[PDB]
RNA sequence: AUAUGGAUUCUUCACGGUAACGUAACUGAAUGUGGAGACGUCGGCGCGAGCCCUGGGAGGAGUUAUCUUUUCUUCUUAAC
């Protein structure tokens, strides 16, 4: 009856990216010396893409896909779940616990994250979480 | 009207905080939505400003047969 799980997918609440999708991929139930809370480190989107017609151009087309990912650490009361799923195997080794507190470490990150996302939305799947939601 | 500095970009249109939110900045046309402008009267209570009262001290003046470390007066600080 545990639905927090590695690969679920939900709905930031506050902070800046309220209404906005996400991932969580490492979570922490029993809270850390560091936000002394139920939480999880969750991967999302920033910007999400255009919609592309058939009247765009090659050009075109490239610059309304990029999407601008993020990570950040955020408390359960915080997160709206939802019933969708998206795999995180190819980006979970590099955000931890680690990437954080350095400012170097989360550039690195974010852009393995980036690569992943423009893969999954090239070759259409997991629709639902690349559309931005209406509020 | 315009230039320089700063900020931003090879992940093109910033990052931090669980969050309330923070900052020297940190593209946004049509169209739409919201806020400010924009509001009665009476009652007590809290707080601010000016005034009033008052202590010590640094100056000036008055009274002094007797008494009064005394009576009067100056000691101020704007928008931004």
Same mark, same amino acid.
């Given at each position: 009856?545990?639905?927090?799980?590695? $690969?679920?997918?939900?709905?930031?609440?506050? +902070? #800046?990216?309220? +209404?906005? =999708?996400? &991932?969580?991929?490492?979570?922490?139930?029993? $809270?850390?010396?560091? @936000? !002394? /809370? +139920?939480?999880?480190?969750?991967? $999302?989107?920033? #910007?999400? !893409?255009? =919609?592309?017609?058939?009247? @765009? $151009?090659?050009?075109? &087309?490239?610059?309304? %896909?990029?999407? =601008? !990912?993020?990570?950040?650490?955020?408390?359960?009361? @915080?997160?709206? !779940? %939802?019933?969708?799923?998206?795999?995180?195997?190819?980006?979970?080794?590099?955000?931890?616990?680690?990437?954080?507190?350095?400012?170097?470490?989360?550039?690195?990150?974010?852009? &393995?994250?980036?690569?992943? /996302?423009?893969? *999954? @939305?090239?070759? +259409?799947?997991?629709?639902?979480? /690349?559309?931005?939601? *209406?509020?």
């Amino acid at each position: 009856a545990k639905f927090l799980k590695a $690969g679920k997918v939900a709905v930031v609440v506050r +902070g #800046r990216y309220a +209404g906005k =999708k996400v &991932v969580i991929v490492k979570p922490h139930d029993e $809270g850390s010396k560091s @936000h !002394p /809370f +139920g939480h999880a480190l969750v991967a $999302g989107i920033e #910007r999400y !893409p255009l =919609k592309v017609t058939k009247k @765009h $151009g090659a050009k075109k &087309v490239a610059k309304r %896909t990029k999407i =601008k !990912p993020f990570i950040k650490v955020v408390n359960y009361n @915080h997160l709206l !779940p %939802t019933r969708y799923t998206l795999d995180v195997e190819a980006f979970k080794s590099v955000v931890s616990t680690e990437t954080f507190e350095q400012p170097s470490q989360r550039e690195e990150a974010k852009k &393995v994250v980036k690569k992943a /996302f423009e893969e *999954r @939305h090239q070759a +259409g799947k997991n629709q639902w979480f /690349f559309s931005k939601l *209406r509020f």
